[PDB]
Amino acid sequence: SHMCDAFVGTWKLVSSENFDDYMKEVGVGFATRKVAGMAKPNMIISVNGDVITIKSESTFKNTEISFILGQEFDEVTADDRKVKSTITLDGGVLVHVQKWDGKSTTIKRKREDDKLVVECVMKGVTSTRVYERA
């Protein structure tokens, strides 16, 4: 058993709050916000050795990142930002920091009851997204 066992599996989006405002703060344009905001992604998390893979799949976009905790990687986000990312575990929470153009956003993923709860923060704006097992 290991690090991220409680995260592994297939998850489906069940609620979102303030996601449009989070995307606005990040710089996402109108049409992308509208289509991205409609999406009901599945999130698929797997672990093989030290390598964690997170896939997001929806009618809007399919994305995939693979990484080792604490080891920076380059990421193209769903809204086409080219960012440098680092993901760590901090007290059982996966903490994902993305840096680009002198800006920074943090996405936190944690297990709470039978849910996977995602908090996205850009400056003073937070969005919360709740996933359940598929």
Ligand X SMILES: O[S+](O)c1ccc(Oc2ccc(Cl)cc2)cc1
Residues that bind ligand X (CB under 6 A): 23, 26, 28, 32, 36, 43, 56, 77-79, 107, 118, 120, 129
Closest CA to 101 of 26, 22, 19, 23: 26
Provide, rounded to whole angstroms, the least separation between the CB of residue 129 and ligand X.
4
Provide, rounded to whole angstroms, the least separation between the CB of residue 58 and ligand X.
9
130 marked as part of a ligand binding site? yes
- Closer by beta carbon to ligand X, 61 or else 69: 61
CB 45 within 8 A of CB 7: yes
- Closer by beta carbon to ligand X, 19 or else 69: 19
- Closer by beta carbon to ligand X, 1 or else 31: 31
Both tokens of 5, joined, read 């066992």
Provide, rounded to whole angstroms, the least separation between the CB of residue 18 and ligand X.
11
129 marked as part of a ligand binding site? yes
3-state secondary structure of 70: coil
| Helix (H) or strand (E) run with residue 34 in it | helix 30-38
Quick one: CA torsion of 72, 77, 81, 83, rounded to 10 degrees? Answer: -10
Provide, rounded to whole angstroms, the least separation between the CB of residue 121 and ligand X.
10
- Closer by beta carbon to ligand X, 43 or else 87: 43
111 marked as part of a ligand binding site? no
Q: CA–CA separation, 46 vs 75, rounded Å? A: 18
The DSSP secondary-structure symbol of 40 reads -
